[PDB]
Ligand binder design. Sequence first.
Ligand SMILES: *c1nc(Cl)c(C#N)nc1CC
Ligand SMILES: [Zn+2]
Length: 197
Amino acid sequence: SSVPSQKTYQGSYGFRLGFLHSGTAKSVTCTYSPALNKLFCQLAKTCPVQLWVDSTPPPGTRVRAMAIYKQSQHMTEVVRRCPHHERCSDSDGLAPPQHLIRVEGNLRAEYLDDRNTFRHSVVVPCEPPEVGSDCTTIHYNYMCYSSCMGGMNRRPILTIITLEDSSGNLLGRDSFEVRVCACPGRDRRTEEENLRK
Ligand SMILES: *c1nc(Cl)c(C#N)nc1CC
Ligand SMILES: [Zn+2]
């Protein structure tokens, strides 16, 4: 399958992602490393991602998330849930069982299987920030471990977040690496130390 672009693109509205500061304690279920541009999270736990713009985009603007393999030799392979987790009875009534990435708590989420590339993606309407806030937050879930055999099989993935108009044309793009693992704080601390050394 052809490979979606991963080029960071702020666009006319100054679109970019943001992450909370969660730390590396034993209790953390989701933690973001700015040094690695990498999110570490437990299976099917809430991953809050902030969405920032300098200017308000038009009504009908949408936000899409899609995963690709990071390594060049695997980028053409569609990222999907492994044979075990795709058969889990963990449906929410909206997400197809094969999709790695879900949006939590948005009844207007739409899930696409692309007719030409076969890649999966989930898209929601882009909303203005709430009354007390300066950004919008979307909650994602990753429904397979990075280590799952017959799925990601220990290969790193990127999540690509695209801001789109009502036809799906590109308005902005950002991305981050993801590891889905049982000990996200410990793995973050280790991978950050490897980078320093
Ligand atoms: C999405 N959509 C709108 Cl209208 C706004 C505003 N204001 N912000 C987002 C998140 C990038
Ligand atoms: Zn799995």
